[PDB]
Amino acid sequence: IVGGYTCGANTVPYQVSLNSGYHFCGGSLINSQWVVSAAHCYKSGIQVRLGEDNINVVEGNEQFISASKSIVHPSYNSNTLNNDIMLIKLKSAASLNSRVASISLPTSCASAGTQCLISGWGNTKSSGTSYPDVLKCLKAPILSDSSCKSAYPGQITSNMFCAGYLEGGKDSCQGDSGGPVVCSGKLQGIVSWGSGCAQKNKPGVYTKVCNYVSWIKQTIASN
Numbered sequence: 136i137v138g139g140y141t142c143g144a145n146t147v148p149y150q151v152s153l154n155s156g157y158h159f160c161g162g163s164l165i166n167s168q169w170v171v172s173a174a175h176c177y178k179s180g181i182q183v184r185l186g187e188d189n190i191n192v193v194e195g196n197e198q199f200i201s202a203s204k205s206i207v208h209p210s211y212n213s214n215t216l217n218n219d220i221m222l223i224k225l226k227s228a229a230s231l232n233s234r235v236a237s238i239s240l241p242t243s244c245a246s247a248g249t250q251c252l253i254s255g256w257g258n259t260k261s262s263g264t265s266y267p268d269v270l271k272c273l274k275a276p277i278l279s280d281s282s283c284k285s286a287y288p289g290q291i292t293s294n295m296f297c298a299g300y301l302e303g304g305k306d307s308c309q310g311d312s313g314g315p316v317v318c319s320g321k322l323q324g325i326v327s328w329g330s331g332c333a334q335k336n337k338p339g340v341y342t343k344v345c346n347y348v349s350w351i352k353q354t355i356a357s358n
């Protein structure tokens with residue numbers, strides 16, 4: 136997260152870190168046994184870390200649970216990042232408490248101009264490189280589809296939306312991939328892609344979760 140703020144320990148209780156010997160992507164806990172992330176975050180050998188603030192210090196509220204199965208969306212296209220969404224099933228259920236909690240799926244899609252909360256342990260510089268140890272947060276608005284399409288002509292599908300600031304300075308970044316965009320208490324986006332981070336006229340591009348709720352519910356009901 137570039138241009139954000141320190142969240143506060145366990146104030147984003149649905150945020151997970153995906154770990155394959157190191158933190159590599161975020162995700163969101165949607166019930167006691169399932170996490171949503173980005174398909175471009177796929178790797179073998181995932182451990183899900185819940186209740187994290189400082190990813191480099193064991194502080195006492197963490198739960199570390201290995202993935203039993205990963206399921207990348209059937210229509211994921213790694214070239215275009217269309218359908219950039221994956222489910223991860225935990226080997227055992229998480230214990231839900233004030234520090235570890237699930238986020239609701241949307242029933243309706245979110246509106247342009249809504250201010251959303253984006254969070255992660257990704258790079259904090261626009262260029263140059265500096266990764267935080269504690270969770271960072273950013274408030275950012277949903278942009279109109281026409282502004283999104285103007286910023287990335289020929290690249291935006293109906294399964295993407297843009298959020299952030301056309302002047303630059305505030306954005307998600309590498310390492311935040313797979314993490315949540317929460318608007319009005321619902322998971323509306325997944326950190327997916329962008330040209331750089333926090334560059335002028337190059338806002339963040341997010342997977343549109345509300346187009347996937349049927350697939351998520353059917354997959355969880357069968358696995």
Ligand SMILES: [Ca+2]
Pocket residue numbers: 187188189190191192193194197
């Ligand atoms: Ca920790």
